[PDB]
Amino acid sequence: YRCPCRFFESHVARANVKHLKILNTPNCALQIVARLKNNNRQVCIDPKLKWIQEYLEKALNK
Amino acid sequence: CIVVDTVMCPNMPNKSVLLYTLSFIYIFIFVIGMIANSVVVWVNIQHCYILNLAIADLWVVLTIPVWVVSLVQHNQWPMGELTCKVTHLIFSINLFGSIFFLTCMSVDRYLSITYRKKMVRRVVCILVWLLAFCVSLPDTYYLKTVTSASNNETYCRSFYPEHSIKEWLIGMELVSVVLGFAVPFSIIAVFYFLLARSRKIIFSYVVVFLVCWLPYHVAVLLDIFSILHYIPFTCRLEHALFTALHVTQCLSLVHCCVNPVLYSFIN
Amino acid sequence: IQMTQSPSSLSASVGDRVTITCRASQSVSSAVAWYQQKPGKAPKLLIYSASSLYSGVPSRFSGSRSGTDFTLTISSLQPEDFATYYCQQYYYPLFTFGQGTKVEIKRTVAAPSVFIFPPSDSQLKSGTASVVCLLNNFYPREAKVQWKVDNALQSGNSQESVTEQDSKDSTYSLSSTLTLSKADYEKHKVYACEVTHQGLSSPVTKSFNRG
Amino acid sequence: QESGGGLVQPGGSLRLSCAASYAMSWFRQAPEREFVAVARRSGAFYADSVQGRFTVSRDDNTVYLQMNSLKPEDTAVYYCAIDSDTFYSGSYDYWGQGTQVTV
Amino acid sequence: EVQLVESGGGLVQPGGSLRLSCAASGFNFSYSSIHWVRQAPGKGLEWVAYIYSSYGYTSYADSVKGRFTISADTSKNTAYLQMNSLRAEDTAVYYCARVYPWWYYKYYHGALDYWGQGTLVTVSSASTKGPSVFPLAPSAALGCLVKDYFPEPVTVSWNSGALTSGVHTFPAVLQSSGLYSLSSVVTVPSTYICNVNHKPSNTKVDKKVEP
Ligand SMILES: Cc1cc2cccnc2c(N2CCC[N@@H+](Cc3csc(N4CCC(O)CC4)n3)CC2)c1OCCCC(=O)O
Ligand SMILES: CC(C)CCC[C@@H](C)[C@H]1CC[C@H]2[C@@H]3CC=C4C[C@@H](O)CC[C@]4(C)[C@H]3CC[C@]12C
């Protein structure tokens, strides 16, 4: 059992993330990956964030 | 605004072929290790470093059937978590112990040439056993069988506190690398080099250890780097890491079979 | 898992806080959702996870967790909040819903109006006798109607059907039908229907005899 | 057994109570037994006549009716009744004695 | 924009089979699992099964395992529940609901975001029949009894839609014979007719009530 993400980032800001990628895998279902502009590093987002799910479920439904 | 991309990872059919291929080499390793380590133990019982090394290697080989059975089912665990926690304990205790007993033999053989001593040697041996046990305990404590809500498929992985997951992964990874390869290899290599002052068998000991355990730790380090997202993600990379991890795991377990022939039979 | 949902039904007036409670049989890691099904329509989602509010619903609804004891709360009940609320968990592979909890309007007690109707002439020739007892404009729903033939209780041949709360009065009406073979209705003389309700000092008996 | 009652000027108030010897109901009897209130395990329903005049409560076992805001129409003996039905069908097997009350 | 429209619901004999459709349109069918939820006629919601559109993971409830089989066709954007050996208890309204299975450390998102207006699936070994109106003369309240009719529904109007106060039409009930029945009553202070329209049998039987 190995999938792209192992842990989330529960403390992230809307103004910091500049790119979101949705990963769909046979092992861990849907997952989110974010590119922070300040650190220019790839991090894994936690769906518990309100704005995250709102934005994502709006993008998929389009 | 934030642009949202979409990515899919279609199933790869090469999994079954590779897993079934390795399930045969594992049986080869199992049989060879038994018929080799059993003879070594019988000889010694009828120098307890080799006895300690033979016992540790034999106990590691005994767990091969469990791993291959779980492997044929695509890394699926049907047995209870009690067996999982127990199996991961005997394997991790005896895999560490065997590596340590190489370092102790490296110093002890050098010690006699340069120079109640048996009492001190026994104390060191028991100390090594307890040290291996303590190092293995953390991972086994956090181990429990799981059943995902999508696959409906049971796996046996390690659950760590959600508020602190990175800490445990990096910590356990660093412990294994810096206490299983970096320190034991350095001590073994330096002492054998000093003893070099036949001269081919000494180089034989060191190179065998390096070849068996170097590529495996490189593969694990690459996996951990990908977890921390230092290496960008892509499906082909995942398959390569999958293949590399399993292949190198096989090339490591050959250690349990090359130990007794290299250290006890060529002499 | 058996997600027991209580109470069975609540009577609440507008502007009155309400609280529906759910209880899982085994631990579920905050995986519980709440739905609202108005009558004759597809259910709706209100609160997922265990207390997170789904987009679009009003802020009145609230959720909470205490071990394995989830709850829902309408802070200020509104006129359009009268429906059935369902409790659903999605931890194990097999999802389960709740038994449902209906929110009913509150109103002053009223007593039923009891009538008994003999079988019609044409229906008699068919071969069966059907006698209907009507309890009209009574609140609350909880009531009981019994059938007595020659001062003997009848059971197994009674079939009830209660309407929904009337818009104007909020008073439920009940109709109990007793069906018998013409070989039976013709061998007895006195029939009676008994209604027991909270707003009645004594049971009301309405009786009639053939002829 | 019901305890309370007495004589009170219009606009006054009283507390009526009755102890054990489910749901409990309060019935009038104008010198025509009438239903005036009821309290269940956990709400309470009041007759249209006394909507706001009175209020019921169930100590947990005694049931208190705050017979408040008297008017020159409430003269009647008040009876405590117990709902023998766990589902509140409306069956009152046990009937109390009551207390004379007048204004 | 989102829509999950169902089709393929109708009368079925016991032991038969029926195939249902759910034409998703307006979202990424590849990323979302699809669930089937059935609500008996007057009971709480019940869960049937789901399917992962792309990876083809499916789970079935304990009461449909071995009889139902859910599949999907991404190219067609539909999900099919094929039911075999249908029983009488399978009568219900079936909804298909979308889900986006987000990954949470301990569980997966499983709140049914969107539902589609269900489709009734009657499973009865009966035959089309007309009603048998019978009058309930006053013994003021009066009514007509519509007995032994099939299939639903039956529409009842009084005096050609002339009465719109005190008229009660109780919900239909199912008896042992397998046919439906309902009674309609109206209260009037001391000529009344009860028009009926059973379209599924092209029947229009009127009657007059008087003692
Ligand atoms: C067949 C097999 C071979 C392995 C070879 C090397 C390592 N592991 C192997 C393994 N697993 C890997 C999982 C983590 N590993 C943790 C662990 C404990 S001690 C240890 N060493 C680290 C290096 C150090 O130099 C000495 C100590 N690593 C448990 C065992 C195997 O089993 C297959 C897993 C199937 C499943 O996942 O179901
Ligand atoms: C069965 C499991 C759960 C317990 C762990 C057992 C294995 C991993 C370890 C625990 C400590 C180990 C023992 C510790 C000390 C000695 C003395 C030595 O001169 C020979 C080996 C021997 C006898 C070891 C055999 C292997 C052993 C029993």
Residue numbers in the entry:
A (entry chain B): 7 to 68
B (entry chain A): 26 to 71, 80 to 148, 156 to 237, 250 to 319
C (entry chain C): 3 to 213
D (entry chain K): 5 to 25, 32 to 41, 44 to 54, 57 to 74, 77 to 119
E (entry chain D): 4 to 142, 151 to 201, 208 to 228
Quote the original article.
In contrast, ACKR3 does not activate G proteins and is intrinsically β-arrestin biased. One of the best described functions of ACKR3 is “scavenging,” whereby it regulates extracellular concentrations of CXCL12 to shape chemokine gradients and maintain CXCR4 responsiveness by preventing overstimulation and down-regulation of the receptor. To address these questions, we used cryo–electron microscopy (cryo-EM) single-particle analysis to determine multiple unique structures of ACKR3 bound to a series of agonists: wild-type CXCL12 (CXCL12WT), CXCL12LRHQ (a higher-affinity variant of CXCL12 with alterations at its N terminus), and the small-molecule agonist CCX662 (13, 14).
A small-molecule agonist, CCX662, was included in our early solubilizations of ACKR3 and was initially thought to wash out before assembling complexes with CXCL12WT. However, we observed density for the agonist in the cryo-EM maps, resulting in the first six residues of CXCL12WT being disordered in both the NB-CID25-ACKR3·CXCL12WT·CCX662 and CID25-ACKR3·CXCL12WT·CCX662-CID24 complexes. To test the possibility that CID24 perturbed the conformation of these loops, we determined the 3.3-Å structure of the ACKR3·CXCL12WT·CCX662 complex in the absence of CID24, which may be the first structure of a receptor in an active-state conformation without cytoplasmic cleft binding partners or stabilizing crystal contacts. The open active-like conformation of the TM helices is maintained, but all the ICLs and H8 exhibit disorder. The conformational heterogeneity of these loops is consistent with the dynamic nature expected for class A family GPCRs in their active state. Furthermore, maintenance of an open cleft conformation in the absence of CID24 suggests that extracellular ligand binding is sufficient to stabilize an active-like configuration of the ACKR3 TM helices. In the absence of CID24, the density is consistent with R1423.50 forming a hydrogen bond with Y2325.58, reproducing a stabilizing interaction that forms in active class A GPCR structures. In each of the three structures, CCX662 binds in the orthosteric pocket, with its core occupying a similar volume as the first few residues of CXCL12LRHQ. ACKR3 structures with and without CID24 lack this kink, and ICL2 would likely collide with Gα based on the superposition of these structures with the structure of active-state CXCR2.
